[PDB]
Design a binder for this molecule. Structure first.
Ligand SMILES: C[C@H]1COc2c(N3CCN(C)CC3)c(F)cc3c(=O)c(C(=O)O)cn1c23
Ligand SMILES: C[C@H]1COc2c(N3CCN(C)CC3)c(F)cc3c(=O)c(C(=O)O)cn1c23
Ligand SMILES: [Mg+2]
Ligand SMILES: [Mg+2]
Ligand SMILES: [Mg+2]
Ligand SMILES: [Mg+2]
Lengths: 247, 487, 487, 245
DNA sequence: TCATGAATGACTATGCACGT
DNA sequence: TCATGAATGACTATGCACGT
């Protein structure tokens, strides 16, 4: 199976890859024009394509279907993925066997992720069931050692760990420049994105798994649905214990 | 590649968004009535010195200073928040003094960042009063380079005064603005009757706060909705504009609208009436003309037909237009990091609690600094009594460390105090200058005693809130705008 | 209502615009090679402390500071100017150190102000070196609130180094960038041969400045255009990219373009070749593939048909694409408020003249301050020699003025010196500190002697330019990028 | 009498008066200035047409391209008259056309671009004295106790300051004299009391004396011939200060 | 279906001179 | 016709909850 990539009927903002093999191809769905721009530069153009999303995605759980299909950002995703939606879905027409969602580490990136996962689960569920959907974990810190190569950290803990280890090893950091803190993908350049989220030999990806379909169906409808009361009581009930989900 | 279940991801991710929005974006803190963007803009302008005792700074500088130190978001939306705080039709008591084109109550958008200048208003200066005296908790900013305030001193009840509206997740707030003088009376009562229970307090505060006071004036019809909002935290308050019937030389009648209810777009209002005649559901109207100007204010002239009754057409406008519209009150605010729907007595009480906290903390800060200052002065006085020796002692010392170490031993003094003796100028060795040091010690010891007396007497603490707030209201308090009538 | 003739209005209005654009917008000052917006951005960042010894500040803060104090224009276009100065493919020696997405040589636009941070580069620090020592004239800003520099010290020949392109009215400039090390040699010669006439100087400078050195590397073909530009002020310099023919195991040969001439958009270049094939104007080409990446740089692979000669296809690319394109040199710059087309010897000479002025002015400032510091120290030494007395007099004084007036009588002292004695701390009455005051006087009188020697000898002055510039080149100078070949 | 919109440009803020003889069109530089002007105007007789960006040079650009320009179409449509041979003074919807631009050089430039459009496409508007130029203020003197004064030149500023101080009035050295760098920096009230209030506004009526002499000057300054323009500036820029001496 | 307001920027058109 | 580079910002779409 092989499909043609655009080179001078696909979304205008899509920076397609060169490889015509979906099994080896990857679509990075990126939050923001800035981050998408740097991703387009730092990527491996052979296997990696970039689809920058602009603004918060439409909630397909709340909005009527006709309005969802009128949304330009949804059309871009559906067109780029090549598969249909709902009953007309066909995995054989999938243009990328890896769909990486890359959003800011901040709170709005988390929101956009739920909006995208809602789109995928409702319109193109088999992509999730067959492990084609991934989540890129962006860095939070860049430790700029004076003489050594810079290190990236993906959590406050790792930052503290790499700092102590380096100092214990005799390395040194400026207390001015020091540890750069990333507040979003848009703040990174092309090189930084490659060496943290796009280089397949270093990137930290999470594969979205779907266990209980019925339980997921209910969670999606509570959180993303039109019923506010149901959503309000769920948050006040479970927000108190978000920290302890993995303990 | 690590595996993650979609249910775990969706739940963790959406709750993190919901909670941060609730606590950290859309809803006001009960103590100062500010959302994070408001608090960060105002403090940025404050720290930058963009104050009413200096010319308006370019508003771009305020946005950029906010962006670079406190609010890790976009210049565009931050400017929008700043602009709102400068519009007299949005805030009952504007916190930003805008210079230039900041838009209109209609569809005329504000000028771009580059065209406008801005500074804090005198009342906003009361929001930040003595913020530098440890009156509020400070936390590191978004990258730990600098500190930002968790809440402002807020020396006037800003939440109730300017109100607040915000859409969060799972909930939303909609608090109307109020008249400062009425709120002050409520606060004055709460301070006097500090032991009164919630039942008595609510009765007293409701008697003094007659209802919301909108910047756009207009009318409030009925008393039930207001009462509901103060007793429940939710109520539907009926608003109305002002209509004055005019007669013509021919003998034609026309309706003149000079006021509209809160948050009604002037242009959308005129367009709605125009479209409702087109189809024709507002018969009796002959002509619609906007005779508004910067000099006469709002003036929408509605000429009616000869076979039309003025009140009939007015009643139709009340029904089919926002000439009469209701304010859906929902008294939701963040209390100690938790969203809570509050009664009016709770809103006042929580604010009073904040003012008492502020003044105790200020008194503590001033008391600590006074003791440090007195401590050093005591050391100087010891040096003056043995001045003949102290000078000789320093001179015969090969270094300043040898001189310092000696001063501790010679006068039985701390190292901090001894450092101050070294730091002393030859100026203060003059006769009158030696005397100033003596008197200054006596001056402070009187201040320390006073400050200690304040901390020991809850009565004085409450008295300071009252007296200081009274000054603010006498200076910045204004007349009621929204007229309250019955059914 | 006053009447005005259309010819009077048109002439006055258009000339005022033309002149301001010519002198005050589009064209570079010959001394520092900067347009007003550049100079104002850089000074704004400098004054704000956005220097290499501190972290990158949010670029919004730089724009706002420029906008609010120096450059009365829009945030959008000012940001565009700041961004350009940070791109290594635009400026041969970047003046802004950008952090984040500042675009690419192709059609990838820079990130918005929001996402990027910026500070001055070490070389930009040389542009502003000792600007606070009255090395350049300052004038009031656009509203007389603050002062701004008319020109920067520019301690390296920035106009020739980074070049300049600008469209004005009735004229335009287009100066290419040059290799700093080569420019320094030219300057070193001009300083040594300061009496040489234009005939000799032009010959010497042209021998040392071998030609333009573009940040995008590439090739320069021929020598006529370069020579014309330096002797006439106008010339057409032929540029070329770099092409490497590779052979595969299949027998297919392909052309690999790894460099392009100055100011050629990578994406427009690929599109041009692709569209020329579609219609069919570059036969012999089989396939176009962009194998470029952040790690290998530019790499455009052009596979050609087997019945095609590589050299034929390359010549076809030279003719019908910007793989070969000419740089239209027009050495136009503002000299003393007047636009002038300059020979290469005039450009160097004018820069050298500026450097000599800077150092004479710096020396004058340092001499004045040295005399002031020495003047006060002389008073201090007098106090130390009669220290026992100095204390007694101050003690008996009712005021400090009584103490001051006496110090004048006792030691025969100015009012400034006596005041300095008064402001003296007991810190400095220690042994080593008293000795420090003595030695410090001796140090300045040695510095004053040195400084006076500089002003009296033009030889040393030229020596300072040479030696200081030499340090700059050794630290920040780099290899040539553009290779110069013959026909 | 002609109908006012309540088939014309969307950005046109038309007046209420249906009489062109009584009507005025303020052609304003920038959305900001146009926005505040729309508020400070007298909606009865004054209409506002905000222009966005540099106007296209009709002297350089071909005719068809000019007619595609949205900013030109707005002007032609709003004025009601035709253009060139199809021009008709009878359809003029405003007998007063006030060009209001910033006091800066780009405002001066936009004026020359507008005057070029008018002179080439709708010349009779100039010949019959329907084209005016509003002179914006440059300074606002903010007295501590007295009403604020506006100045239209550096000289007037110095004069009003001197008179006021001599009369015993006082100003802050912080707030002090606000300096306008463009119409966009002004609010509705300030624009009314300086450029739109008919009892205080400073208008200049554009007159056309020698049509032939004007025709060549327009072609030199605005035409495609750079050399002719370059030499004209270097020849006459030396003496612009002395045009009215 | 529209308003609220604090969050997630690219695109659009001209002046100006010069060379393709 | 297009690129250059400083000059002169409005419009476009979603989330979120609630009331007409
Ligand atoms: C998130 C960025 C980019 O996307 C945006 C919009 N688009 C959404 C996607 N497209 C359907 C076209 C419209 C938009 F209409 C407005 C804004 C906006 O106001 C804005 C700001 O900072 O204030 C920032 N953005 C916006
Ligand atoms: C003058 C303002 C308003 O008009 C502008 C544009 N057009 C908008 C649609 N019109 C049909 C013609 C003009 C434009 F394409 C770009 C800009 C722009 O970049 C800008 C800036 O400060 O950077 C400021 N402006 C622009
Ligand atoms: Mg983000
Ligand atoms: Mg926005
Ligand atoms: Mg622009
Ligand atoms: Mg202007």
């Amino acid at each position: 199976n092989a499909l043609v990539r655009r080179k001078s009927g696909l979304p205008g903002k899509l920076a397609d890859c060169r490889s015509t093999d979906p099994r080896k191809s990857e679509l990075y769905v990126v939050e923001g024009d800035s981050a998408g721009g740097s991703a387009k530069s730092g990527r491996d153009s052979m296997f990696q394509a970039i689809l920058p999303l602009r603004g918060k995605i439409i909630n397909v759980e709340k909005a009527r279907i006709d309005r969802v299909l009128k949304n330009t950002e949804v059309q871009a995703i559906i067109t780029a993925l090549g598969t249909g939606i709902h009953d007309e879905f066909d995995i054989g027409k999938l243009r990328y066997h890896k769909i990486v969602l890359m959003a800011d580490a901040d709170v709005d990136g988390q929101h956009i992720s739920t909006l995208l996962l809602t789109l995928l689960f409702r319109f193109m569920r088999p992509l999730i069931e067959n492990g084609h959907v991934f989540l890129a974990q962006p860095p939070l810190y860049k430790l700029k050692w004076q003489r050594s190569d810079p290190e990236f950290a993906y959590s406050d803990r790792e930052r503290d760990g790499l700092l102590e280890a380096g100092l214990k090893a005799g390395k040194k950091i400026n207390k001015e420049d020091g540890i750069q803190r990333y507040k979003g993908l848009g703040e990174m350049d092309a090189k930084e994105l490659w060496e943290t989220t796009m280089d397949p030999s270093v990137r930290v990806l999470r594969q979205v798994t779907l266990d209980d379909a019925a339980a997921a169906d209910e969670l999606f409808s509570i959180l993303m649905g039109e019923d506010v009361d149901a959503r309000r009581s769920f948050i006040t009930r479970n927000a108190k214990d978000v920290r302890f989900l993995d303990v | 590649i690590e595996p993650v279940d979609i249910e775990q991801e969706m739940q963790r991710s959406y709750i993190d968004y919901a909670m941060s929005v609730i606590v950290g974006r859309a809803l006001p803190e009960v103590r100062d009535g500010l959302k994070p963007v408001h608090r960060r803009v105002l403090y940025a302008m404050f720290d930058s010195g963009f104050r009413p005792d200096r010319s308006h700074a370019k508003s771009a500088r305020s946005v950029a200073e906010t962006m670079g130190n406190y609010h890790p978001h976009g210049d565009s939306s931050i400017y929008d928040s700043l602009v709102r705080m400068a519009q007299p039709w949005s805030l009952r008591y504007p916190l930003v003094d805008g210079q230039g084109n900041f838009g209109s109550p209609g569809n005329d958008p504000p000028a771009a960042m580059r065209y406008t200048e801005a500074r804090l208003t005198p009342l906003a200066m009361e929001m930040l009063r003595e913020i530098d005296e440890e009156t509020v908790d400070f936390i590191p900013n978004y990258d730990g380079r600098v500190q930002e305030p968790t809440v402002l001193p807020s020396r006037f009840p800003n939440l109730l005064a300017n109100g607040s509206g915000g859409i969060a997740v799972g909930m939303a707030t909609n608090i109307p603005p109020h008249n400062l003088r009425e709120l002050a009376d409520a606060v004055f009562w709460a301070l006097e009757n500090h032991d009164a229970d919630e039942e008595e307090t609510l009765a007293a505060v409701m008697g003094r706060v007659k209802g919301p006071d909108f910047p756009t004036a207009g009318l409030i019809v009925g008393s039930q909705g207001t009462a509901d909002a103060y007793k429940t935290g939710r109520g539907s308050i009926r608003m109305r504009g002002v209509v004055e019937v005019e007669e013509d030389s021919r003998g034609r009648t026309s309706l003149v609208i000079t006021e509209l209810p809160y948050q009604v777009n002037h242009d959308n209002f005129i367009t709605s009436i125009a479209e409702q005649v087109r189809d024709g559901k507002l018969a009796g109207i002959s002509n619609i003309e906007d005779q508004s100007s910067d000099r006469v204010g709002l003036r929408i002239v509605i000429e009616i037909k000869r076979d039309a009754v003025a009140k009939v057409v007015i009643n139709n406008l009340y029904k089919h237009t926002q000439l009469q519209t209701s304010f859906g009150a929902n008294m939701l605010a963040i209390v100690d990091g938790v969203p809570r729907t509050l009664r009016l007595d709770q809103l006042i009480r929580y604010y009073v609690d904040h003012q008492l906290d502020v003044i105790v903390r200020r008194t503590t800060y001033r008391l600590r600094k006074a003791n440090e200052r007195a401590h050093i002065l005591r050391g100087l006085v010891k040096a003056l009594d043995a001045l003949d020796e102290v000078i000789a002692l320093i001179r015969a010392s090969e270094t300043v460390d040898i001189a310092r170490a000696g001063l501790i031993e010679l006068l039985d003094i701390d190292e901090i105090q001894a450092q101050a003796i070294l730091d002393m100028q030859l100026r203060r060795l003059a006769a009158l200058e030696r005397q100033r040091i003596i008197d200054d010690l006596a001056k402070i010891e009187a201040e320390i005693a006073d400050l200690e007396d304040i901390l020991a007497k809850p009565e004085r603490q409450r008295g300071i809130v009252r007296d200081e707030l009274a000054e603010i209201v006498d200076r910045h308090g204004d007349d009621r705008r929204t007229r309250i009538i019955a059914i």
